[PDB]
Design a protein around this ligand. Structure first.
Ligand SMILES: Nc1ncnc2c1ncn2[C@@H]1O[C@H](COP(=O)(O)OP(=O)(O)O)[C@@H](O)[C@H]1O
Ligand SMILES: Nc1ncnc2c1ncn2[C@@H]1O[C@H](COP(=O)(O)OP(=O)(O)O)[C@@H](O)[C@H]1O
Ligand code: ICS
Ligand code: CLF
Ligand code: SF4
Ligand code: FES
Ligand code: FES
Ligand SMILES: [Fe+3]
Ligand SMILES: [Mg+2]
Ligand SMILES: [Mg+2]
Lengths: 274, 121, 477, 522, 121, 280
């Protein structure tokens, strides 16, 4: 009954990495569930194969209110083991955009969707800003383990720093801790050892380094995970390796935030920024 | 009815006189007096007008109705404890946090606090 | 019996509804388990009625003007707004009073603003002040004015509070503004709350700085008895025979001075929890006056309540209580001996808005009758907490029952008697089922005390064992 | 204390000595009642003439009105159509009060629903209430038609019915072909009869506005009958009987007489009888349309004249002798059917009764209040009987109606005493019957208190009440009485003359004091 | 002057009317009305009567004198920030936290908050 | 008749064990008494309820919305013949005043009406280490009429006893709070019976029964019961009863005379506890 959350800047493959991770865990006799906290509801499409899963926020407004909402209408097991929920979000400019996460997470506890057969619960959470309902996993102690999906680019390392700052603030209130870093590779030089440098200074560990591949592009058209498409793919074994280290990861640390210069100096030495 | 508006965005707390029970809500009184509570919808679902209300005359607290729409929005924002929900359902007593666009002014003295941020931090 | 049968009946009754209505109405029907202490997990109450389902509930104006403020006899109550609201509630509730109507009592009269289009467009505050002036010259012996607002008053944005303050200061008169617009609240319960708040904020704290009233250690105040057919007078004679002095009566046959003298009184005896628990809690927190709930329906409940009340005083009051019980014992023994054999074993379903279904169950059981169904239009979850113990196992419980639901439940259960209001009486009489009006006592009563128990037994035997109920079907048919 | 053999209800149980002592103690101790001499002085002051000038002066305060609000009449009109549910858009207290009022008057079930609009709708309007209520009512009570009225809350909000119902149909809450006529019935305009008129015009316009192309006047050889706000079942029955005895094809539009009088046979019928949608659709094909109560059917008259192209005759309410004669004459002229011998014999019997009762009736003073058409018909009948209507009150009458009634009173020597009051309530009438004592009152149950007041001044100032009108609450089954036609005229005559004779019998009953006039034969 | 007292120990906020400028301080007003602010000295040197004052009518804020004795006590309980000390010295405006036994009632509307604990937590 | 009592002293000297044993004796004589635990650690009702650390008002008010929503029956339990037991508890360490729970619990008991008429004694067990804050509130607000200070031969326990007597005399004018006596709990140190007698004479008060140490107390504590119930026939059971009779028969409620720190030092050397001190 370990619940984890995936935090990172938008566009860093976090939704796909969570889905291929989940597909990698479904085969090995584990029943897991994905909760999509990203406002755009593309975080369960490879599992469900659906064009666009109806979000809890969407169907609550059409059905009057969230009380008139049934769990069997929001929770779809497109894959038999995998359970997929899309929280959804409000329209831009209308209230707090993270309030969709609060409604969905509260709804799932109310209906008891966390009962007796879940091994892992994964939250795919927007990481550009940590506030409102996006900081809700860390603030409410919903997700004990947190993995950050980062990149060589400076904004991704800056995003990883902000999440660690928010984990420190709620370290005393809750058991939530940084479980590790996930480095998703664009075809740039000196990346894996760059993020290892980041992790070594944060007091946390790197978990894996997933490289860019073209097998994922074939999977996109299928609306399927790479694992279910081509289980013999080099990327598909890479995702098994990342999955196996997630289950057998034991150290969970309170992060150490990194200042502006100190993060900057790491970029200059590797040459990513001049 | 006397209403005291308070906000860190406001250099000074503002004191206004309001007619109780108007069809126009607390949002009416605020807009007529230039109090900048963020209003971002016309259907009462966004929750951006969340305010903290304190009844200064505790003897003169008036029973009211917490509608199902306001209640659900307060849960979605998170500003509704289970005890306050039971208090409203059984004793018809207002909760600490309210939506200004759905709050009817009563004949008492009120302190209204807002941060300038939408409900839900 | 037949708990599973009751559950299946509820399920098959709920099938006509659309999904929203079915889902909501499922929360409001229950099978009674007397072992439950918290009703809210078992059943839900105090919610909005489903649109277009023929609810029996009223509005906040009915709960304030028609229930709490109306019985007060020396005050003049103005129905502020159009004419319908005042017209339909005029003398429709039997709250008994002693006075000369139109001179010093005004209970059965209809004072209204009679709003027209220009009143809606421009407002009625100046009209309200003019009306207040007209009332004082026309009726110089009135001892106070209350302004019960109807829907357009709050809908157009009138300021009745400032008008009340100005006119009261000018004329040295008590003017109480009540914002009891019908759209506020889901039923009459919020009307009760608003009326209690108005009493607390404009009436109760007036004789605070005076001490000319000579108090007594045996001072009590009856709270929440509205003298329906004279109930409060029977309760009062029973209390005074016990050695206590009743200073106030809320609000049947009530006066403004009796309300103002309630802070001086040592103890509050609250007959109805739903309508007047708010002011009782306020008085306990402010003046330190304790309060308790009593029941004067039937001999068993009456004796239990009398002993409980006497337990709060010295031993002379207890001796007088035993004297009263001994004096009244043979009367209700004779009543039971006459009427129980005729009524033994009959099954009755009830549907009254708050307190009374639970309140009369003991009186029915004192005659060998059993209540298969108990139901409330507006009760809260505390009332259901109180009523679950008093109802038998596997009996039906309903909240805000619709007409269709009640008709189907009655058709399946087939009780020998139904107790409800005027809006169900002629529905259930055409079905060949005896019906007793449990709001107005079918223009009979009182039912409180032993004097009321005699009349209650006579009325139940009268209606249930009537020849006309065997004449319902044509002989050729 | 009660004796089990003779159990006493509140009267006269509270006349016992212990209860009297209890009430005296309560009044002396805690009520702070005014001195009884002061109360008597104030009562005697309220009797006098200077009080009447103060009472007449008031321009704002209304005391004991004699009218209701529009949605009551709208519900009554909607109840007269087959398998139709009255639906009031607004708060539920309105519907509860309407149902209680009609239940007390007719002692019959009254079916009506609301959408239970609350503070949520007070802020954001009641469109969702309309959609949910329409779907719920159609699913639950299965009507063939839903007629929508409004409360004062809806009108102040500005919620519009047409857009709400169209959006309900467009979004799949109710089928697009389901008939949902509607009308706006503000309670701050007019009275209940105005609401009846508005609802009838709404329904008629709903069914007969978009297909006028194939409508030919007189093609079905029938006469449309619009009764108006009517609370006497005998009036519907007598209109039907008079037209059926005359061989005249007719269509009674909005007749509720079946649902308001259903047999008790072990089952409950929510719907019974009523005007069919086919009759409403075929209404413009009729030869003409007659309005039984013209003075509260004005918008309906405008619609029928300007859309159905019917030359609506100028007829008064068929009350009394002359106006019943005129109604039968107009029906004969329109339908081409002669008046049969049965109606002539009935009219002759009415004249016989008038000549038999004339000596008691001659010169009796009557104070009367009621709806405009009913009041004017009653005044006309009183004039034809030789009686003097001295106080005529109509809370919901206008200046044109007052002019017509004054013209009616001018054409008879028995209307010299008569004066007409509009906008006055029953407190004004109490002052009038105190300062200018008539012999009797004619009105609804609300006059029973006025009699009470008069009895307090003394038996020689008591003005007995005669219960004709709406609502009658303290008597049973009087709603089955007939006011219209020769039958209604003779029922009214019997009531009046026997009330006079009963009053005389009561006055002359004292042994060795007045019983020299206690005659066996009268 | 209208004073609203507020404390977690008080079930309801209490509203009182007071005469401004009396030699008896806010401690006087509280004691006549039965408000249980802890008073544990007669020389004004403890911090037990520490309260939080909010000027509800922000326009009607009266200039006052922050006595050197009260200033030092407020600093001894860590309740006088440097910015508020400078505002009192230069603008003669009251700080947020005050000592009730040393606070003179002014002609305005005030909200007085206390926890039932002495100053210094 | 509503004799309200308080027991003060240094942490770890045996206030809770002495209070619960005293209270158990009082119930044996048919006295309806109540224990209110004002110690932050909230273990002063273990040996009456026998269950565990009693749920405190701070925990119940926190899980619920607030104090007034909390039920009287939820926090006030009945054990050992119905002697009522309540625990004030405390806030999180480093947050607010450590005595805030005492201020909260006493207000809740008064508002509800738990101070019913048919109670004879009410005992408060409060940590005396610091006098200030919510631990002085019973003295300041006239909550406890008479105070008994548990003290031992140690320097700290003697210093804490002098501190508590300083608090009483400060509030003596404003209320009826008075000093009832001193209870000497034994560490088996030599010449301590007369040391506490001497301190009581210096303070101007009597000395309540001196309690010798024994391992029978731990025997009843490991089973979570008072010594008097575990053995009624033991000498400690009668000794606890003897302390309780002197408490009921106590009538010397005096305003103490706090002594100077140097006087405490001087009076410690005269009994051999402190070695004689020379500045050079
Ligand atoms: N391990 C990977 N190898 C190659 N490409 C990837 C990998 N993970 C993600 N991508 C690509 O990166 C893009 C970002 O995907 P997505 O997760 O939807 O965005 P976000 O991270 O904002 O949720 C996708 O279009 C995907 O094709
Ligand atoms: N009369 C006694 N004889 C022997 N040991 C005792 C006696 N009273 C208490 N103790 C021991 O002293 C320890 C601490 O006592 P306790 O009552 O917890 O102190 P406090 O006054 O801080 O509550 C306990 O573990 C207990 O075993
Ligand atoms: S006031 Fe209330 S509906 Fe408590 S609105 Fe209603 S004369 Fe009923 S169950 Mo009519 S809460 Fe009284 C009542 Fe009970 S009018 Fe009477 S009978 S004991
Ligand atoms: S819920 Fe209550 S009873 Fe209803 S109106 Fe509103 S306050 Fe009144 Fe009176 S006048 Fe007629 S019946 Fe209504 S529609 Fe306008
Ligand atoms: S007053 Fe005493 S208990 Fe409270 S915080 Fe200060 S030192 Fe701690
Ligand atoms: S303005 Fe959107 S909820 Fe109030
Ligand atoms: S009471 Fe000590 S500073 Fe105020
Ligand atoms: Fe009938
Ligand atoms: Mg994505
Ligand atoms: Mg301890």
């Amino acid at each position: 009954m370990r619940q984890c959350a995936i935090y990172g800047k938008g566009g860093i493959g976090k939704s796909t990495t969570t889905q291929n991770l989940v597909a990698a865990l479904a085969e090995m006799g584990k029943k897991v569930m994905i909760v999509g906290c990203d406002p755009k509801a593309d975080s369960t499409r490879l599992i469900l194969h659906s064009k666009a899963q109806n979000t809890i926020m969407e169907m609550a407004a059409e059905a009057g209110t969230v009380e008139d909402l049934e769990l069997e209408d929001v929770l779809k097991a497109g894959y038999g083991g995998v359970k997929c929920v899309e929280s959804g979000g409000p329209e831009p400019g209308v209230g707090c955009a993270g309030r969709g996460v609060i409604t969905a997470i509260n709804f799932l506890e109310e209906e008891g969707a966390y009962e007796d057969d879940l091994d892992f619960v994964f939250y795919d959470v927007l990481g550009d800003v940590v506030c409102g309902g996006f900081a809700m996993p860390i603030r409410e102690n919903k997700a004990q383990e947190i993995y950050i999906v980062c990149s060589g680019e400076m904004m991704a390392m800056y995003a990883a720093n902000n999440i660690s700052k928010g984990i420190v603030k709620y370290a005393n209130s809750g058991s939530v801790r940084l479980g590790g870093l996930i480095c998703n590779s664009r075809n740039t030089d000196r990346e894996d050892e760059l993020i290892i440098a980041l992790a070594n200074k944060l007091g946390t560990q790197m978990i894996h380094f997933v490289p860019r591949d073209n097998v994922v592009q074939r999977a996109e058209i299928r609306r399927m995970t790479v694992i279910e498409y081509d289980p013999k793919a080099k990327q598909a074994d890479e995702y098994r390796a990342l999955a196996r280290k997630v289950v057998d990861n034991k150290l969970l640390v309170i992060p150490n935030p990194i200042t502006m210069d100190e993060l900057e100096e790491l970029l200059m030495e590797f040459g990513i920024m001049e | 009815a006397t209403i005291y508006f308070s906000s860190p965005l406001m250099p000074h707390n503002k004191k206004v006189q309001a007619v109780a029970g108007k069809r126009s809500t607390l949002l009416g009184v605020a807009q007529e007096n230039g109090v900048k509570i963020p209003f971002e919808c016309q259907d009462g679902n966004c929750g951006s007008c969340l305010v903290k209300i304190t009844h200064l005359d505790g003897e003169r607290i008036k029973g009211m109705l917490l509608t199902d729409k306001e209640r659900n929005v307060l849960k979605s924002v998170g500003k509704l404890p289970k005890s306050e929900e039971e208090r409203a359902a059984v004793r018809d007593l207002p909760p600490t946090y309210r939506l200004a666009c759905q709050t009817i002014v009563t004949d008492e003295d009120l302190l209204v606090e807002f941060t300038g941020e939408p409900g839900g931090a | 019996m037949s708990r599973e049968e009751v559950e299946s009946l509820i399920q098959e009754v709920l099938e006509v509804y659309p999904e929203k209505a079915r889902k909501d109405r499922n929360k409001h029907l229950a099978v009674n388990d007397p072992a439950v202490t918290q009703s809210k997990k078992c059943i839900i109450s105090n919610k909005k009625s489903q649109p277009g389902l023929m609810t029996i509930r009223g509005c906040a104006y009915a709960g304030s003007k028609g229930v709490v403020w109306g019985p007060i006899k020396d005050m003049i109550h103005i129905s502020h707004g159009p004419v319908g609201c005042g017209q339909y509630s005029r003398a429709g509730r039997r709250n008994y009073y002693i006075g000369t109507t139109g001179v010093n009592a005004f209970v059965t009269m209809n004072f209204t603003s009679d709003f027209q289009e220009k009143d809606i467009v421009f407002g009625g505050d100046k009209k309200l002040a003019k009306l207040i002036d007209e009332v004082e010259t026309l009726f110089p012996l009135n001892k106070g004015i209350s302004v019960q607002s109807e829907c357009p008053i709050g809908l157009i944005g009138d300021d009745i509070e400032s008008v009340s303050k100005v006119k009261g200061a000018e004329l040295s008169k008590t003017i109480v503004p009540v914002r009891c617009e019908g759209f506020r609240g889901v039923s009459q319960s919020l009307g009760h709350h608003i009326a209690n708040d108005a009493v607390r904020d404009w009436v109760l704290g007036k004789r605070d700085e005076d001490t000319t009233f000579a108090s007594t250690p045996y001072d009590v105040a009856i709270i929440g008895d509205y003298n329906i057919g004279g109930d409060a007078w029977s309760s009062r004679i029973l209390l005074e025979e016990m050695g206590l002095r009743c200073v106030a009566q809320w609000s049947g046959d009530g006066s403004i001075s009796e309300i103002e003298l309630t802070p001086k009184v040592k103890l509050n005896l609250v007959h109805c929890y739903r309508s007047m628990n708010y002011i009782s809690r306020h008085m306990e927190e402010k003046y330190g006056i304790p309060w308790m709930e009593y029941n004067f329906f039937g001999p068993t409940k009456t004796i239990e309540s009398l002993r409980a009340i006497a337990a709060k005083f010295d031993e002379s009051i207890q001796k007088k209580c035993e004297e009263v019980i001994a004096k009244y014992k043979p009367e209700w023994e004779a009543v039971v001996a006459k009427y129980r054999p005729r009524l033994e074993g009959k099954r009755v379903m009830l549907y009254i808005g708050g307190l009374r279904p639970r309140h009369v169950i003991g009186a029915y059981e004192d005659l060998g009758m059993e209540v298969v169904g108990t139901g409330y239009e507006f009760a809260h979850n505390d009332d259901y907490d109180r009523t679950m113990k008093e109802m038998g196992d596997s009996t039906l419980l309903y909240d805000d029952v619709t007409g269709y639901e009640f008709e189907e439940f009655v058709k399946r259960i087939k009780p020998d008697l139904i107790g409800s209001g005027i809006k169900e009486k002629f529905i259930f009489q055409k079905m060949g089922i005896p019906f007793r009006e449990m709001h107005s006592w079918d223009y009979s009563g009182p039912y409180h005390g032993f004097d009321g128990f005699a009349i209650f037994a006579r009325d139940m035997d009268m209606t249930l064992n009537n020849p006309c109920w065997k004449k319902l079907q044509a002989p050729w048919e | 204390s009660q004796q089990v053999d003779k159990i006493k209800a509140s009267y006269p149980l509270f006349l016992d000595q212990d209860y009297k002592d209890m009430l005296a103690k309560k009044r002396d101790g805690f009520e702070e009642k005014y001195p009884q001499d002061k109360i008597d002085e104030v009562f005697q002051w309220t009797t006098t003439k200077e009080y009447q000038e103060l009472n007449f002066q008031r321009e704002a305060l209304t005391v004991n009105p004699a009218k209701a609000c529009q949605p009551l009449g709208a519900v009554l009109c909607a109840l007269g159509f087959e398998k139709t549910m009255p639906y009031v858009h607004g708060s539920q207290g309105c519907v509860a009060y309407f149902r209680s009022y009609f239940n007390r008057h007719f002692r019959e079930p009254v079916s009506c629903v609301s959408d239970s609009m609350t503070e949520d709708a007070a802020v954001f309007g009641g469109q969702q209430n309309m959609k949910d209520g329409l779907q719920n009512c159609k699913a639950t009570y299965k009507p063939d038609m839903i007629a929508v009225s409004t409360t004062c809350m809806a009108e102040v909000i500005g919620d519009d019915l047409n857009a709400f119902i169209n959006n309900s149909k467009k979004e799949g809450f109710i089928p697009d072909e389901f008939p949902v006529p509607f009308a706006h019935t503000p309670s701050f305009v007019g009275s209940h009869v105005t609401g009846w008129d508005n609802m009838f015009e709404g329904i008629a316009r709903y069914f007969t506005l978009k297909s006028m192309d194939d409508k030919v006047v007189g093609s079905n050889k029938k006469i449309n009958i619009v009764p108006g706000f009517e609370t006497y079942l005998g009036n519907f029955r007598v209109i039907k009987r008079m037209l059926s005895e005359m061989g005249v094809g007719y269509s009674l539009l909005s007749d509720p007489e079946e649902v308001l009088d259903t047999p008790a046979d072990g089952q409950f019928r929510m719907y019974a009888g009523g005007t069919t949608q086919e009759e409403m659709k075929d209404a413009p094909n009729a030869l003409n349309t007659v309005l039984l109560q013209p003075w509260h059917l004005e918008k309906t008259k405008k619609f029928v004249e300007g859309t159905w192209k019917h030359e609506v005759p100028k007829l008064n309410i068929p009350m009394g002798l002359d106006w019943t004669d005129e109604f039968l004459m107009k029906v004969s002229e329109i339908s081409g059917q002669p008046i049969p011998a049965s109606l002539t014999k009935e009219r002759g019997r009415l004249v016989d009764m008038m000549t038999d009762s004339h000596t008691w009736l001659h010169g009796k003073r009557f104070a009367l209040w009621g709806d405009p058409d009913f009041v004017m018909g009653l005044v006309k009948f009183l004039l034809e009987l030789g009686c003097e209507p001295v106080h005529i009150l109509c809370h919901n009458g206008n200046k044109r109606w007052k002019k017509a009634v004054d013209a009616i009173l001018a054409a008879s020597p028995y209307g010299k005493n008569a004066t007409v009051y509009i906008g006055k309530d029953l407190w004004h009438l109490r002052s009038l019957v105190f300062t200018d004592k008539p012999d009797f009152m004619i009105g609804n149950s609300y006059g029973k208190f006025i009699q009470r007041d008069t009895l307090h001044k003394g038996k020689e100032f008591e003005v007995p009440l005669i219960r004709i009108g709406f609502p009658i609450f303290d008597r049973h089954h009087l709603h089955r009485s007939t006011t219209l036609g020769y039958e209604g005229a003779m029922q009214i005559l019997t009531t009046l003359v026997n009330s006079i004779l009963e009053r005389l019998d009561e006055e002359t009953r004292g042994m060795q004091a007045t019983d020299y006039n206690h005659d066996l034969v009268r």
